Paper text:
P7 is the key phage protein to regulate gene expression programs of both host bacteria and phage Xp10. P7 binds to host RNA polymerase to inhibit transcription of host genes. P7 turns on transcription of late genes of phage Xp10 by assisting host RNA polymerase in bypassing intrinsic terminators preceding the late genes. The structures reveal a unique binding site (the RNA-exit channel) of the phage protein P7 on bacterial host RNAP, where P7 exerts dual regulatory activities on host RNAP—inhibiting transcription initiation and preventing transcription termination.
The cryo-EM map of P7-[name]-TEC shows clear electron densities for 6-bp upstream double-stranded DNA (dsDNA), 9-bp DNA-RNA hybrid of the transcription bubble, 3-nt single-strand RNA (ssRNA) in the RNA exit channel, and 13-bp downstream dsDNA. The RNAP clamp in the P7-[name]-TEC is closed and the overall conformation of Xoo RNAP is essentially superimposable to E. coli TEC. The DNA–RNA hybrid in the P7-[name]-TEC adopts a canonical post-translocation conformation as in E. coli TEC, suggesting that P7 does not affect the conformation of the DNA and RNA during processive transcription elongation. P7 inserts into the RNA exit channel and makes extensive interactions with RNAP with calculated interface of 1182 Å2. The C-terminal helix of P7 (residues 48–62) forms a four-helix bundle with βCTR and β′dock. In the structure, [name] locates at outside of RNA exit channel, where it interacts with the tip helix of βflap domain (βFTH) with a hydrophobic groove of its NTD domain. P7 resides between [name] and the RNA exit channel of RNAP; the β2/β3 loop of P7 inserts into a cavity of [name] S1 domain and creates a moderate interface of 221 Å2. Specifically, the W32 of p7 inserts into a phenylalanine cage of F155, F165, and F200 on [name]. Structure superimposition between the Xoo P7-[name]-TEC and E. coli [name]-PEC reveals that the hairpin-interacting regions of [name] has been occupied by P7, explaining that [name] losses its activity of enhancing pause or intrinsic termination in the presence of P725.
Author numbering:
A (entry chain D): 249 to 316, 321 to 496
B (entry chain D): 1324 to 1371
C (entry chain C): 3 to 43, 49 to 237, 243 to 255, 277 to 510, 515 to 769, 775 to 920, 925 to 950, 953 to 1010, ...
D (entry chain D): 1 to 147, 156 to 166
E (entry chain D): 745 to 849, 860 to 933, 950 to 966, 977 to 1007, 1012 to 1024
Write the structure that this text describes.
Amino acid sequence: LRPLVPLDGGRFATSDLNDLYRRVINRNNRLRRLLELNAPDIIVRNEKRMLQESVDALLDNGRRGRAIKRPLKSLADMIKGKQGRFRQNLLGKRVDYSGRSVITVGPYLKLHQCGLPKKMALELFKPFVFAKLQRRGLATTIKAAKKLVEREEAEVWDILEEVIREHPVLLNRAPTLHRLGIQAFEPVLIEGKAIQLHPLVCTAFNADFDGDQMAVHVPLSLEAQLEARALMMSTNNILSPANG
Amino acid sequence: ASFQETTRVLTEAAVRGTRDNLRGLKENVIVGRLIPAGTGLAYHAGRR
Amino acid sequence: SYSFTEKKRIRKDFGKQRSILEVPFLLAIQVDSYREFLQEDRKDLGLHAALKSVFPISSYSGNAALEYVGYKLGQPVFDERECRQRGMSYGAPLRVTVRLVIYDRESSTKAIKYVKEQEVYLGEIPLMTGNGTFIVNGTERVIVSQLHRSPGVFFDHDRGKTHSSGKLLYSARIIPYRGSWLDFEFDPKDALFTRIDRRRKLPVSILLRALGYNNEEMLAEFFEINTFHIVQLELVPERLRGEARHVKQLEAAGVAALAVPDDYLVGRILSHDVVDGSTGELLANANDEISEDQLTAFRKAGVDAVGTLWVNDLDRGPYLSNTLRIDPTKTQLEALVEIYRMMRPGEPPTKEAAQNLFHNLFFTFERYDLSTVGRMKFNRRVGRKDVLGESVLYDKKYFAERNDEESKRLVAEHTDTSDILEVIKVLTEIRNGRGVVDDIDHLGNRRVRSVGEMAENVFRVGLVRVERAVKERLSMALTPQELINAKPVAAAIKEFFGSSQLSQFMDQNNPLSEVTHKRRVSALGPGGLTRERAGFEVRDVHPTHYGRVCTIETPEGPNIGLINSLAVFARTNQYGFLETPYRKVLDGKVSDDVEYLSAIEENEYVIAQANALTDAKNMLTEQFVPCRFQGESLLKPPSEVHFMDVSPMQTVSVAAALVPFLEHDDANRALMGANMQRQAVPTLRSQKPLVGTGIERAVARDSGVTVNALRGGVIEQIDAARIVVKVNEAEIAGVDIYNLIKYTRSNQNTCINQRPLVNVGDVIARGDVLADGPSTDIGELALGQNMLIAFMPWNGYNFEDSILLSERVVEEDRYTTIHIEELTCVARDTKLGPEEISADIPNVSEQALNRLDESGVVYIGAEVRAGDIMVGKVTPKGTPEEKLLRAIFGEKASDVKDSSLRVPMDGTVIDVQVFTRDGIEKDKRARQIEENEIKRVKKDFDDQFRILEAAIYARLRSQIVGIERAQKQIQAHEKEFEARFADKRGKITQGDDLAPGVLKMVKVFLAVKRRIQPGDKMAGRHGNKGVVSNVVPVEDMPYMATGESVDIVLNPLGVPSRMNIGQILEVHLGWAAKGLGRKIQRMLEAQAAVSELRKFLDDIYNHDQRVDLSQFSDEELLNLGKNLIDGVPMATPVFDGASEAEIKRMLELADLPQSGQTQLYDGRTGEAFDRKTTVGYMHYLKLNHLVDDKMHARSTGPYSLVTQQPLGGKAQFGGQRFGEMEVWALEAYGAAYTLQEMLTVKSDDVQGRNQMYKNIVDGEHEMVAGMPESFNVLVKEIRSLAIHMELE
Amino acid sequence: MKDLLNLFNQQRQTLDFDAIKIALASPDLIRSWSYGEVKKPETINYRTFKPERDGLFCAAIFGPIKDYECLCGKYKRMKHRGVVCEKCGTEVTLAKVRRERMGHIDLASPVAHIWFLKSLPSRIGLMLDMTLRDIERVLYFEAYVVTRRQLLTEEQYL
Amino acid sequence: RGLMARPDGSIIETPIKANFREGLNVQEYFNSTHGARKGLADTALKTANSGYLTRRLVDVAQDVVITEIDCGTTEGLIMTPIVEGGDVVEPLKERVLGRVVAEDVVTRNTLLDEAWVAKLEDASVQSVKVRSTISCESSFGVCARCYGRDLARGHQVNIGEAVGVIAAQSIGEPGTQLTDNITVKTTGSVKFNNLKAVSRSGELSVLDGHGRERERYKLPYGATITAAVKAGQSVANWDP
DNA sequence: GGGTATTCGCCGTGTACCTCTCCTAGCCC
DNA sequence: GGGCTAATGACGGCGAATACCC
RNA sequence: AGCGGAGAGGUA
Ligand SMILES: [Mg+2]
Ligand SMILES: [Zn+2]
Ligand SMILES: [Zn+2]
């Protein structure tokens, strides 16, 4: 849970909990050596005071002692705060099967459909492409199927077009203060590097078209796909959650 | 202890010895079970 | 009268008035501060001041003194390109001459034995490259200026911060340069409190008792004391005014000391004590409330005067009496040990230790060290006539009892200044005499620290560490070279120049960005404020910023106002304050004299604005001029003004002046456009801006990306890589040669290039350009291209700030940019075996091995693709068949691992750089490129020697027309060339510096030329950013009546919303310029005369600033007409000129409509539109935010080991962070099964993602969820806090 | 380091519970939590890539570095499970137990938890009916405690 | 463009007598960029405070889940149109529409639609008892009838909808966009409310032709009233 | 003992993304 | 150069200890 | 060979 990070040349990165643990163990061993020596009361009193201060720096650093140009983290700061283990890894998590790109405007699209790049949809829908290539018989193993995907022939485009036909994706704005910041669309394959969007969608997203990026997510379970079709579609979310 | 003063709520739960019955929405995200709102209400009805 | 660069092309310039003062050097403050810091050429202030301040060292045992006579800076061992390519720092050695003397103990002082250790090595000072940059580990760093609080004394207040009342408290703070901070705070119970370095607050009576002052003396000095009589008292005519006809009658009558009853004496406080020698006891204490028993004792003693204090309600306040009443300490030693206990908590009291601590806290030079600017601010705030003073805080009572040698010199020059009592008295007159306070919002209250002051500060810190080492090292006294250690000062200067908040990575994509980054000031730093703190009071602009700090150049994000930009004519004063020039205005006529006024001197005189009309050459024909007095507008007669602005470009910076029509645009869009111009990318062919300003030439000159001829002459020898000039006899022994950089990467992975523009055999002057730099025209700055604009909605493709592009803007390669990437292959040394660069790699097909050579690396100039192996690298990873295979081969049969360099972005390889270490056998390709480099340096050294010998022989042939010095000069040049060739050969034959653990490094330069794609961010000139929607063919674009197809179709809906209309005037001026260029091309296409072109240029240049056409030549006029065949560029000043009548006249001069709106037809159906649209040429550029950098996706990549979650970022295949607000939105949807499979199955669970992946690739549907591993991490982290958390 | 046979099996943990209980921890329960005692503040020895015995990074207390491997190398097979090596004492088991097992420190003198003292609703101050400054002076070795509840200066104690 | 404002609160004595079509002086551009920097800092702090308030309101109201379809609460809430002495804040047709009624004004426990709002406007009703969520008798949840109708769909709210996160997000929407004499303005008959002038709380509410209340002014103690009252007059002149 | 009146701390202050550098280095041979 | 080697330019809301004459 | 803590710049 507290690993060491190596650098180039054999060096290791400094740690916060390991230095506090080494200080506590060293002061405890010094207290044991002073107790075995039968030291007078002043020396063992100062050693017990240093042991109490090192335990205080180990448990909650920065409250009374503030052990160090920058104060290192402790067990109390690793739980609380914004950068702790509770807000960065439990409420908000990094997810796979996801990517982001810039957005342009597409007037030829419908309300329920949106655009998606070819290489982006090939990277996102790669397990379904592998499963369909195993089912069609074009490759016996997944290594030959992966080499056929990276070779980029026309059959992988046929597989990617047949997979993406009835599979919705979750388009998300990077601020999500709105209730309708996440909407489901049926993507199509376009010959570009951006994500085309309907002009009636960016009003609810409050999104412009100058350097705006939108992260996409693909649901892969059947329950998630049916939930995205039923209660996340852009054609079903017409009214606002604030007023009528 | 989710948004403010984690140490105070943690030491209060440590002294009193409370028992979290998981009857909420955020604690089901923390534990990893289904949300008891919408499609997950039938699972909570069949569990109890 | 005109140079060759101006004779090449002349742009039309119209305005209201001419410019008096020219544009100065834009990077002058950094190079002048570094020249004052280095003192390379005396040496009163700078590094020599710190060297003279630190190096006098007195040991504890005596007979040890260190002296120095000077310092010398050595030459750098490498070139600038050598440190840029090899990775070294462009530094210079600093050598001092430490003189060590030894005195004789137990005798008189005498120099028994003195030594002088010359060339004491300490540190390496990185020198500037002439433009404000220095190479730190192969990268160029720019140290920006800091806008901090100036040293001195300030008086602030707090409005409702304490006591929840309407009354306000005052605070006095003494800010030193390198000492401990002193404070003086009030109290709501009318008391004074002080604290040192934000410690626990103490009353000022303890500090005044530790200084050595008595209560009677401070009560006689602060409060005016009256006398009494034995009861009666003296009559004061001024004291009766507080209690107008009665005071006037008492003044005109002239009364004596009248009698007063005892009812007026009970309400007073006794000033001084009274004693009686006959009684033997004190009848009354000093500073006490008078009682009846004390009055009876004073009447029995027979005292004459008991003393009183002038106490009022608003005019006077008894604060020192309450301060003495609060503090019970009446002993100087008790006050000293109380101060020592407040400074160091938990220590036993010691007399001489606390005395030495109080002496070293405030009253020494080694610890406090108040600067001269702080002394000047102190004397200006208090009100003393003298400006320069002592560098240490002086007291009248503290230095009177000292027995030191410097104290007798200090007490003779100051003559009882008593600055502490002066500060307390000035604060008392602020509280009581109704004085004004000053907030920290002026440019005179702030100060600018350049790179030299911070470098001197960190060098003084390193010298203090070296002195603290040498004070212990010289305790037993050998050579002085073994005492001074270079390691702490070298580590301090490396930690300063390498990793600091003021030394950041610069940007070199644009010359304008380079100029505005070298000129940028920043309020952040070690002494500055934090961006996270509430700083609304300093983010808003102050009226002192007019003329010194640019107001509209401000970055977006958290730092809106903390990161400012310096103005054009603004410079730094001698004390660090900012100054701006003005014009000396006499009564009536205005003299054209330039006087740089400071920020604290501009408010005293009435300064008129630059928008003042003048009928004569220099007069004032307005009865009420728009002048300012205290930063606000005012209407004053012209007989009372004293100063006026020199130019309307004084307010804006160099990045805000280049955008035309600033007076017609909004402030927010101008703020966006001033920041959007710093992110432009240089294209293949750069075009001049049709609507410019005139400050582009100064920015291109002071940017440093172009070369300039120092001495004019013949350019008969010219190449694409080098330019050889031949100077004349007036400027000169050898001729000058300029080497041009062709293709090297910048700090932003862009390509810089220097293409020449002069021809063979043409005379020049001093200052003409010889090669246009990157994103640079023939002497103007060029950021983008010129293209047709139509403001109309086109089928929703330009819906909300979207940009429409044609096929003609893509097929002619107008926005094609060159990007150079750096890809390295590092071969480390492992414990199992060193990694080789061999080409024989197993499990690799021949299709990826044809481009590899026998060396294992790729050739130069090979078209590679994504995933191609450029450098083949293998590493050893460590049955009888394996033993048979190992015995059949030479111990290289198996047990190897493939780890080679691959391309992540397809392009050609332009350069392959191979770095090797000593003791390693070089490769045949490394030997071949070594032969290539030595052949290249032999060839260009032979060419330079042949050119120098030809110049010397030409001078000798010119000298023998009508004899020995030319031969000696040729011999010296041959010896210098031989020494330079020997230095280069010894430099390029040895192994370079590498890390401990690496044997070989191969760096491959990959140059990619990317085209324009739909989705790329492209902004204009006035702040109208956009994203390309799609690429449309030419047949669908709308066409005019003549057949010209519009390239870009913009949206006119942003004009009333964003409230900028300067782009419409820029479009109209570009349309007029393109019409003039087409008319010039139509005139020069047929056989025309010179007089028609002359009268046409005289019609389009001036109309009645003044450009004469009968001056240069006929062939120069034909060259000007050939240069103006693409368009006639116009110059528009930033706050004057370019009215509507001038634009309408330039439109009506050609065959163009007056309103600028012509009717164009649609290209899709061939029909005509209902209205006429605005068509014209706008200077449109391309930003650096590409679509390839932002588009990325992943299915399954690597995971972290602390928690089982994917990584982040575009590198290493990071996943997108599913934030908390998205989880809130999905919980608002309901969505239990969607949220369960998002944060448990896909991300957190180890077995769950494998089960889901195999259920996807198998076809069955069986989802089994589990607990996240981060919850187990949180449980194990809670259990480490001795708190039991169980899952029941 | 690399293991592929153990990686294929799944459904090992059910993760089915009803409630979460949080309470204090007795020292006997903390002693029953851990598997070993640390004694030396040495993590990784110099000039070799091997963990230090009885340190913060140790194999005898938490788990082995490589999967199904010891520090010396006497057992290099997946069939050996639940066996402790003789030279360097560690169990030949999975390398994922280093993330689960923990250790403990035997302190020579007892210390006070800062989460029960430094908080403004102080629990030790309410249980002993004492102010915060008195316990702050006692725990930082500045005064004495009689054993009824009053402060004592060392001279007053003398 | 008129006068410009300074951040300390004082208005500049001279305005900018020039638009963007003509030229602007440097002293006018200084005040323009001063106002621009003030607006940029204002929207930055507004965005930060709106995000913090949105997070706090989400974490406060997250346990309310629609669990049961009917509870059986007959407490009710009285709905009145909000007049703050000037123009109307929220009228009756916006505040009433979307919830069921408690007492018979109409049939109880019936969801109101636009036709029922039009019928109540034709009947000229002033106050109707409504069923709100502040008076509920459910166990750890909100009843489906006390909440009314959904906001995304026009029908009844479904069982299991989390109406807390939607409410907190809808309150946290516009936070980035935030910032004597009784003379009537509109015509209509004046009807006194809680009057006896000896009155502690006086309300000078008026009734228009359709039956809605447009103006409602406060009346102090001892207010002299002069008074089918036309506009342009004063019912209560002054009361110092 | 018991009410105001300051006063020392405790605890918090938006999200998402993209580039770059630099990491404990010091010493007596 | 070489291998171990243990500052003091934030700001607002809020519950809890001192001071003290009646 | 994968797992990271600060500092700086930029976009929405
Ligand atoms: Mg935008
Ligand atoms: Zn073993
Ligand atoms: Zn209910």
